[PDB]
């Protein structure tokens, strides 16, 4: 049993499995950052 906790800055890469496009790329440094 392991735990993955995204409670500090992380990266998100949204991709098409087939065409291998990166649709979006993100760094979340603060989910509430204005």
């Amino acid at each position: 049993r392991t735990i993955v906790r995204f409670n500090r800055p992380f990266l998100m890469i949204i991709v098409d499995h087939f065409t291998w496009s990166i649709f979006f790329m993100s760094k979340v440094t603060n989910p509430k950052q204005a």
């Binding site: 993955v4 409670n7 800055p9 990266l11 998100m12 649709f23 979006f24 993100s26 440094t29 509430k32």
Partner: protein
């Protein structure tokens, strides 16, 4: 070919955006910017043209302009294919001053290769041209991008626009009854309270990267899309970012292995960022498009057009049911 370049371009853009604003959220669509700039290159010749193609990370000793445009035509067709599982659409358009005549070859290529329909617009009525472009993007993004164009110089001759809309459901959705306010640590000693979603007892692709001191997991959407999540250890974000590349991404994917996970915690959040890409395009070698030496003659037949500004806005919503993400890119062009 196009796949490798578009990924290379993605990570090059990411690194430059982080440099400009080290403390900010980042969210952008690489495919939207690549397609918008490739659309622009349809109208370019000589140094202006070769700078764009190489800035997009294509190797012109192994590819040609026609093959690059065909790659983007095929990509747009593949992305806009029907799906019962995922909403995904990409559109292109050109907003052209009413009294301006364009090459038939450009207008025809823009339609056939990029699916672009021209829009006659009175750029001398700024607020009408502004709302006309913004309504097109707002409509394409289902209301998510409302103010892509903030200011329009009155002497603008043309604006090329790309938008992307993405709305998908998680393969393994979160239960909102399990969503609880929890800490998100901006630093080792500072936090903000956010709604923290959670999943319990699940098997997902997983890879602990000890070389880079980060953990990678993959969450699937229904349909052909997925998301790589990378969690650097504390004080290791900059070290991971420096290692982002097509090879690192390939290594992570090839190292992923299904693994049972007791608990997964992911914030529910919505973020947006708006960008002036002039600086970054300059750093990639795309310069002549912006100067009096600009060669956009393949648009009207004369070297009388120059890019003034390239802008990008993107929005990412992450929630229990899935993800909604949207972006648009605009290339503003004035007489030379």
């Amino acid at each position: 070919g196009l796949a490798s370049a578009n990924v290379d371009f993605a990570f090059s853009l990411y690194k430059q955006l982080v440099l400009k604003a080290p403390d900010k959220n980042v969210i952008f669509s690489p495919v939207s910017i690549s397609t918008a700039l490739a659309f622009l290159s349809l109208g370019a010749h000589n140094t202006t043209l070769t700078e764009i193609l190489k800035g997009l990370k294509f190797n012109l000793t192994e590819t040609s302009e026609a093959e690059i445009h065909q790659s983007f035509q095929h990509l747009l067709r593949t992305l806009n294919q029907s799906s019962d599982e995922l909403q995904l659409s990409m559109g292109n358009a050109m907003f052209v001053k009413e009294q301006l005549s364009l090459l038939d070859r450009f207008t025809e290529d823009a339609k056939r290769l990029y699916g672009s329909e021209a829009f006659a617009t009175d750029f001398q009525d700024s607020a009408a041209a502004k709302k006309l472009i913004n309504d097109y993007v707002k409509n394409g993004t289902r209301g998510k991008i409302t103010d892509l164009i903030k200011d329009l110089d009155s002497q603008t001759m043309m604006v090329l626009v790309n938008y992307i809309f993405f709305k998908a459901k998680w393969e393994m959705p979160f239960d909102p009854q399990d969503t609880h306010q929890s800490r998100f640590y901006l630093s080792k000693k500072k936090w903000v309270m956010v709604p923290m979603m959670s999943l319990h007892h699940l098997t997902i692709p997983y890879f602990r990267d000890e070389e880079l001191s980060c953990t990678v997991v993959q969450l699937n959407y229904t349909g052909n899309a997925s998301v790589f999540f990378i969690l650097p250890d504390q004080d290791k974000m900059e070290e991971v970012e420096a290692m982002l590349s097509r090879e690192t991404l390939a290594r992570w994917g090839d190292s992923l292995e299904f693994r049972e996970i007791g608990e997964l915690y992911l914030p529910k959040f919505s973020i947006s960022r708006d960008y002036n890409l002039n600086d970054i395009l300059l750093q990639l070698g795309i310069e002549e498009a912006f100067t009096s030496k600009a060669d956009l003659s393949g648009i009207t037949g004369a070297r009388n057009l120059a890019v003034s500004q390239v802008v990008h806005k993107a929005v990412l919503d992450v929630f229990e049911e899935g993800t909604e993400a949207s972006a648009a890119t605009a290339v503003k062009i004035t007489l030379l």
